[PDB]
PDB file of C-alpha atoms in Angstrom:
ATOM      1  CA  UNK A   1      78.763 179.497 141.431  1.00 34.58           C
ATOM      2  CA  UNK A   2      78.399 179.954 145.354  1.00 34.14           C
ATOM      3  CA  UNK A   3      78.799 176.434 146.609  1.00 34.16           C
ATOM      4  CA  UNK A   4      78.596 175.015 150.451  1.00 33.15           C
ATOM      5  CA  UNK A   5      79.255 171.267 150.698  1.00 31.67           C
ATOM      6  CA  UNK A   6      79.606 168.293 153.565  1.00 29.54           C
ATOM      7  CA  UNK A   7      81.528 165.688 153.093  1.00 30.83           C
ATOM      8  CA  UNK A   8      80.363 162.052 154.544  1.00 28.97           C
ATOM      9  CA  UNK A   9      83.058 159.539 155.392  1.00 27.51           C
ATOM     10  CA  UNK A  10      82.321 155.558 154.483  1.00 24.81           C
ATOM     11  CA  UNK A  11      85.172 152.325 154.984  1.00 26.01           C
ATOM     12  CA  UNK A  12      83.376 148.949 154.785  1.00 27.48           C
ATOM     13  CA  UNK A  13      85.341 146.453 155.736  1.00 29.08           C
ATOM     14  CA  UNK A  14      84.952 142.386 154.492  1.00 30.47           C
ATOM     15  CA  UNK A  15      86.438 140.679 157.783  1.00 30.39           C
ATOM     16  CA  UNK A  16      87.115 136.609 156.711  1.00 28.58           C
ATOM     17  CA  UNK A  17      84.175 134.282 158.659  1.00 30.70           C
ATOM     18  CA  UNK A  18      85.824 131.040 158.843  1.00 29.21           C
ATOM     19  CA  UNK A  19      84.072 128.474 161.645  1.00 29.12           C
ATOM     20  CA  UNK A  20      84.917 124.939 160.923  1.00 26.58           C
ATOM     21  CA  UNK A  21      82.460 123.118 163.929  1.00 26.50           C
ATOM     22  CA  UNK A  22      82.620 120.575 164.541  1.00 21.34           C
ATOM     23  CA  UNK A  23      79.468 117.725 166.276  1.00 21.86           C
ATOM     24  CA  UNK A  24      80.753 114.055 167.564  1.00 20.28           C
ATOM     25  CA  UNK A  25      83.303 112.924 169.775  1.00 18.94           C
ATOM     26  CA  UNK A  26      86.855 114.050 170.745  1.00 20.63           C
ATOM     27  CA  UNK A  27      87.946 110.927 170.550  1.00 19.81           C
ATOM     28  CA  UNK A  28      88.007 108.108 169.164  1.00 20.80           C
ATOM     29  CA  UNK A  29      88.042 104.953 170.852  1.00 20.97           C
ATOM     30  CA  UNK A  30      88.203 101.540 169.139  1.00 20.59           C
ATOM     31  CA  UNK A  31      88.420  97.496 171.514  1.00 22.67           C
ATOM     32  CA  UNK A  32      89.791  95.266 170.116  1.00 25.41           C
ATOM     33  CA  UNK A  33      88.422  92.170 172.751  1.00 25.10           C
ATOM     34  CA  UNK A  34      86.918  89.231 170.928  1.00 26.59           C
ATOM     35  CA  UNK A  35      88.704  87.457 168.271  1.00 27.81           C
ATOM     36  CA  UNK A  36      85.496  88.336 165.533  1.00 24.06           C
ATOM     37  CA  UNK A  37      87.224  92.420 166.202  1.00 22.44           C
ATOM     38  CA  UNK A  38      90.100  91.071 166.134  1.00 20.94           C
ATOM     39  CA  UNK A  39      89.409  89.807 162.291  1.00 19.82           C
ATOM     40  CA  UNK A  40      87.730  92.195 160.975  1.00 20.41           C
ATOM     41  CA  UNK A  41      88.218  95.725 162.655  1.00 21.53           C
ATOM     42  CA  UNK A  42      85.207  97.426 163.966  1.00 19.78           C
ATOM     43  CA  UNK A  43      83.489  99.946 161.561  1.00 19.20           C
ATOM     44  CA  UNK A  44      81.851 102.826 163.505  1.00 18.75           C
ATOM     45  CA  UNK A  45      79.687 104.688 161.548  1.00 19.29           C
ATOM     46  CA  UNK A  46      78.503 108.163 161.669  1.00 23.10           C
ATOM     47  CA  UNK A  47      81.232 108.769 164.393  1.00 20.60           C
ATOM     48  CA  UNK A  48      82.251 113.033 163.371  1.00 22.03           C
ATOM     49  CA  UNK A  49      80.272 115.431 161.364  1.00 21.51           C
ATOM     50  CA  UNK A  50      81.676 119.026 160.686  1.00 22.43           C
ATOM     51  CA  UNK A  51      79.590 120.675 159.560  1.00 19.54           C
ATOM     52  CA  UNK A  52      81.413 124.974 157.476  1.00 19.97           C
ATOM     53  CA  UNK A  53      80.545 128.082 157.516  1.00 20.19           C
ATOM     54  CA  UNK A  54      83.264 130.675 155.058  1.00 22.36           C
ATOM     55  CA  UNK A  55      83.088 133.651 152.801  1.00 21.98           C
ATOM     56  CA  UNK A  56      85.593 132.351 150.121  1.00 23.56           C
ATOM     57  CA  UNK A  57      86.563 129.872 148.212  1.00 24.93           C
ATOM     58  CA  UNK A  58      87.201 127.431 151.096  1.00 26.28           C
ATOM     59  CA  UNK A  59      89.612 123.929 150.285  1.00 28.57           C
ATOM     60  CA  UNK A  60      88.665 121.295 153.220  1.00 26.74           C
TER      61      UNK A  60
ATOM     62  CA  UNK B   1      90.865 239.804 131.870  1.00 25.70           C
ATOM     63  CA  UNK B   2      89.265 239.825 135.083  1.00 24.46           C
ATOM     64  CA  UNK B   3      88.671 237.122 136.943  1.00 24.37           C
ATOM     65  CA  UNK B   4      86.355 235.591 139.234  1.00 25.94           C
ATOM     66  CA  UNK B   5      86.810 232.371 140.416  1.00 26.88           C
ATOM     67  CA  UNK B   6      86.477 229.627 142.679  1.00 27.51           C
ATOM     68  CA  UNK B   7      88.257 226.244 144.344  1.00 28.00           C
ATOM     69  CA  UNK B   8      87.144 223.225 145.153  1.00 22.78           C
ATOM     70  CA  UNK B   9      89.406 220.376 146.539  1.00 22.71           C
ATOM     71  CA  UNK B  10      88.782 216.448 145.383  1.00 22.92           C
ATOM     72  CA  UNK B  11      90.560 213.708 147.361  1.00 24.05           C
ATOM     73  CA  UNK B  12      91.104 211.082 145.847  1.00 23.43           C
ATOM     74  CA  UNK B  13      92.679 207.187 148.326  1.00 21.86           C
ATOM     75  CA  UNK B  14      92.409 203.894 147.527  1.00 22.93           C
ATOM     76  CA  UNK B  15      92.185 201.957 150.271  1.00 25.20           C
ATOM     77  CA  UNK B  16      93.925 198.586 149.246  1.00 25.82           C
ATOM     78  CA  UNK B  17      91.662 195.631 150.228  1.00 23.98           C
ATOM     79  CA  UNK B  18      92.369 192.845 151.249  1.00 27.55           C
ATOM     80  CA  UNK B  19      89.870 189.467 152.708  1.00 23.87           C
ATOM     81  CA  UNK B  20      90.349 186.102 152.982  1.00 25.10           C
ATOM     82  CA  UNK B  21      87.178 184.218 154.411  1.00 23.93           C
ATOM     83  CA  UNK B  22      87.508 179.491 155.089  1.00 26.05           C
ATOM     84  CA  UNK B  23      84.482 178.087 155.769  1.00 26.29           C
ATOM     85  CA  UNK B  24      84.632 174.536 157.735  1.00 29.80           C
ATOM     86  CA  UNK B  25      86.085 173.366 160.513  1.00 29.78           C
ATOM     87  CA  UNK B  26      88.734 175.509 162.474  1.00 27.33           C
ATOM     88  CA  UNK B  27      89.690 171.987 164.388  1.00 24.89           C
ATOM     89  CA  UNK B  28      90.430 169.316 161.846  1.00 25.22           C
ATOM     90  CA  UNK B  29      90.328 165.654 164.052  1.00 28.92           C
ATOM     91  CA  UNK B  30      92.045 162.475 163.002  1.00 31.34           C
ATOM     92  CA  UNK B  31      91.384 159.723 164.670  1.00 35.06           C
ATOM     93  CA  UNK B  32      93.217 156.585 164.288  1.00 35.07           C
ATOM     94  CA  UNK B  33      92.018 153.457 166.435  1.00 36.68           C
ATOM     95  CA  UNK B  34      91.478 151.391 163.711  1.00 36.69           C
ATOM     96  CA  UNK B  35      93.883 148.337 162.188  1.00 39.39           C
ATOM     97  CA  UNK B  36      92.767 150.469 158.177  1.00 39.89           C
ATOM     98  CA  UNK B  37      93.220 152.994 159.421  1.00 43.56           C
ATOM     99  CA  UNK B  38      96.790 152.995 160.887  1.00 45.52           C
ATOM    100  CA  UNK B  39      97.884 151.264 157.441  1.00 41.28           C
ATOM    101  CA  UNK B  40      96.078 153.456 155.163  1.00 36.96           C
ATOM    102  CA  UNK B  41      95.486 156.733 156.935  1.00 35.68           C
ATOM    103  CA  UNK B  42      92.118 158.885 157.343  1.00 36.49           C
ATOM    104  CA  UNK B  43      92.024 161.044 154.138  1.00 37.11           C
ATOM    105  CA  UNK B  44      89.024 164.277 154.399  1.00 34.20           C
ATOM    106  CA  UNK B  45      87.543 166.210 151.251  1.00 33.76           C
ATOM    107  CA  UNK B  46      86.843 168.836 151.385  1.00 33.95           C
ATOM    108  CA  UNK B  47      87.902 170.583 155.006  1.00 36.42           C
ATOM    109  CA  UNK B  48      88.579 174.183 154.521  1.00 31.43           C
ATOM    110  CA  UNK B  49      87.969 176.641 151.866  1.00 33.85           C
ATOM    111  CA  UNK B  50      89.100 179.207 151.075  1.00 34.68           C
ATOM    112  CA  UNK B  51      87.274 182.524 149.103  1.00 37.78           C
ATOM    113  CA  UNK B  52      90.010 185.107 147.893  1.00 38.27           C
ATOM    114  CA  UNK B  53      89.456 189.241 147.651  1.00 37.14           C
ATOM    115  CA  UNK B  54      91.972 191.533 147.228  1.00 38.04           C
ATOM    116  CA  UNK B  55      92.724 194.504 144.806  1.00 39.36           C
ATOM    117  CA  UNK B  56      96.316 193.833 144.120  1.00 38.02           C
ATOM    118  CA  UNK B  57      98.384 190.900 143.040  1.00 36.12           C
ATOM    119  CA  UNK B  58      97.978 188.579 145.206  1.00 33.15           C
ATOM    120  CA  UNK B  59     100.088 185.377 146.593  1.00 34.14           C
ATOM    121  CA  UNK B  60      98.557 182.856 149.223  1.00 33.09           C
TER     122      UNK B  60
END
């Protein structure tokens, strides 16, 4: 039972990837100068959007 | 009782045979450069093997 052997060591790392990419304007400005704006207020549509890249279970 | 004789001398030597044959690498190097290596450490399998040839009782 003569034995000649060679060994290799395998190292595997699962680095966590957590990315939150936001597109839009980092300043959102509401300007009230008319009466209508005062009574009803500015409604801004699609100001900021968020995209999520993840490896594990995530909650935003 | 007439005698004619011839003599031969027999010499026997039991020379001790002590052999320790090692296979592998005479340098074993542990390199730590990653955090995982630091916390857990390199485990090297089958680095060196030893074979013993002997005639008498031996302890290694």
